Amino acid sequence: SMPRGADQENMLKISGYPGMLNTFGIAQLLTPYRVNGITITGAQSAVVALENKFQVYQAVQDFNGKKLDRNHKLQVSSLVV
């Protein structure tokens, strides 16, 4: 799960992917960014700790609004507003 003590600037929320994905599959959605921990928060949502705030910034830009298929659209946001 998530490293104890993680900094919020390293974290993002991701949702909308297929409901059967496991933690490794969620990490695969975020290729190539470094994933250090994932906390599932529902079938189609999780909170993810990436290596740092720059990777969070780029992951939001790369993946927010991404059409995975005609049935699934990703919502990606940084935990730090």
């Binding site: 297929p18 059967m20 189609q44 298929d69 005609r70 049935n71």
Partner: protein, 93 residues
């Protein structure tokens, strides 16, 4: 058991001599395959029944493209292909 929405097919009229690798090979030509199984056979044994899930809806759409009246036609076979549907309410959000 839940499968990626709209990525899976029920397969009928599989030739009696095929195993799951034969079925896999046919569907691999259209894209990556997530799962493949021969589940039963007919009464006369002449044909078998199966299930194939593609890795992505895009792969499954490329299958739907090469169909002709619900059938996949090969140089010496003809498969009856229908869309698989998940059971409602089984996913726990």
């Amino acid at each position: 058991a839940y499968y990626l929405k709209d990525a899976g097919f029920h397969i009928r009229n599989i030739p009696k001599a095929w195993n799951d690798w034969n079925l896999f090979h046919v569907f691999q030509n259209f894209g990556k395959v997530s799962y493949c199984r021969v589940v039963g056979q007919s009464n006369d044994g002449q044909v078998q029944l199966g299930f194939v899930n593609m890795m992505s809806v895009a792969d499954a759409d490329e299958v739907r493209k090469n169909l002709n009246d619900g059938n996949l036609i090969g140089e010496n076979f003809t498969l009856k292909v229908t869309d698989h549907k998940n059971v409602g309410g089984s996913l726990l959000p």
